[PDB]
């Protein structure tokens, strides 16, 4: 499945400067001279030295023949050595007598002649070289003449790309070998010892051409070096989406990055996805594709293929791109299949999976990903990035396919998969949803669900299983008398009795909480004198609303900000590395919902902070500072909060939680005012969050800061 992409080979060669092409031929010659030298007794370095810049003179005969020349054994001699730089097996032949020319008949010689010229050899052979008298040049002029001969040969023929790739098949690996012999590195623009290069890892000549656009192509590395020898960059979202490098397949594979053997599943899933695309003829063997492995919030990874936009320009080389969210493996589809067969992507995919493993954000960051890749190989460079040539001839790295919209697309597909649950959904009133009703949240009230919290169908995308989840009030399994809230799944035992169990691990509760991020439960109490505490599922929520049920309606309705939970989380996120500071972030957020206000790592704020509307305030005095002012500043993440903004997923959910909570209590951020009694708590909190406690803030300063943000 494939053959050689001749234009990809030919493009690499054609886009070299003339100087770099001469150098390529020069290194090929050097390789063949080394072979001649070692295989002969005297060990003369004349040709070697007269070529490698000694001022002794060495005669060469040139021919109307590509890749070929003669090294006479003496001035004007008809005997010596015939060189064919493109011959698999006879790169040099000793010509001791005329008849030696007659015995040369292989296609690797015949190919070096144009269609027009090929007839000269008659049963084809080089016997006719005996009647011709070639011109003599000094050897220092040879690589130039060979370059000009190849250009002419290509111009004499109609099939430019194929003739070019054929005529270079065996020249290129010899050139690469010649370059690896260059002591202490190849020169860059007249400066010696600049460019390290080894021949190790090269496959057969044909396989190197087959793999020219593959991620670790050795020949692409050699071409890149030749470009660097003669002279000699990171993207933003607008530039990327303006470049439009990648076209979605429209199909994706969502997998878990956690659990033992997750990495094996990801590798197999990704190789599987590539194999299916080739069979279904969505993708051709030689098409350049980006296999994206992108982390997804909740410790998941999506594999998704993209085909390169033909609008982009020429693809120069495949490679590995590292995004903040994952890696892309770029090469021809056939290169990716072969690479999977060989295990070439295993260190990369192991590294990525280990850091996506239990990521709340699906955003381990470029540095963590890069480090995890280099872990499976002491401390090497980062893998070479794929590159393309734009319309004006500039070679640039290809942007990642893991753009903003890419993830929007991923989210759409997932949500279409989630559209068949809950036979008939319950038809609840706004008052029931606000938790204002004595009858409960709309579920059926029972002993272990006294609040009547509504059951929810959790679709476990991994297990392919549906679970029914209710936020229930259960005994604190030790101390009698007190109860706590827990999300639990119901199931039938052997006898048809309904039993209940916890989420087995934080990851699953986290995913449930995201999937049902908009729903509220009463985690407080229910009855006439009692405090209902109404809280959204969103795992990034640091607020809730609450009230006391009256004989009719409610009273003391207010929004509460969870000061220390918020403080601790933000201080953690402020470091830029939450995991380093506190645990697994996913575990931290799930655990937050079970933790009381004064039981977080930070306990600095003496109480929770309260906002209420003017009309509902009762006898609470209000400030003119609004939840909206708070949200505006939080959303902007200024000054010491700046790094929180690196995790947009977390920050958007924090804000959206706040807005949903304001709305659900029948209010809005601009109609919710901070209690006078919360003043000091708020200024202390923001002072710390925004300035590390270096600046004393007041509410007016906080309101003005919000005002400044809306003005811009
Ligand atoms: Mg032509």
Residue numbers in the entry: 17 to 69, 72 to 140, 158 to 267, 273 to 752
From the reporting publication:
Combining experimental infection, cellular, and structural biology data, we demonstrated that nigritoxin is a potent toxin with lethal effect for crustaceans and insects. Typical signs of apoptosis were also observed in hemocytes of nigritoxin-injected shrimp and mimic cytopathological symptoms observed in animal infected by V. nigripulchritudo. This suggests that nigritoxin is a major virulence factor of V. nigripulchritudo and the hemocyte its primary target.
The crystal structure of the nigritoxin was solved by the single anomalous diffusion (SAD) method, using a selenomethionine-labeled protein and refined at 2.1 Å resolution. The overall structural topology of nigritoxin is divided into three globular domains: a N-terminal (aa 17–268), a central (aa 276–460), and C-terminal domain (aa 495–753). A surface loop in the N-terminal domain contains a metal ion that was modeled as Mg2+, since this ion is present in the crystallization conditions. However, treatment of Sf9 cells with the chelating agent EDTA did not substantially alter the cytotoxic effect induced by nigritoxin, suggesting that the role of Mg2+ coordination is structural and not important for the activity. The C-terminal domain of nigritoxin contains two interesting and not yet described structural features: residues 512–544 form two large loops, each composed of two antiparallel strands that project out of the globular surface like “rabbit ears”. Comparative analyses with Blast against PDB, DALI, Phyre2, or ProFunc revealed that neither the structure of full-length nigritoxin nor that of its individual subdomains resembles any known fold or protein structure, meaning that to date this protein structure is an “orphan”, making the identification of an active site difficult. On the other hand, deletion of the protruding loops eliminated toxicity, as did replacement with alanine of two histidine residues (His598 and His650) that are suspected of contributing to a functional “hotspot”.
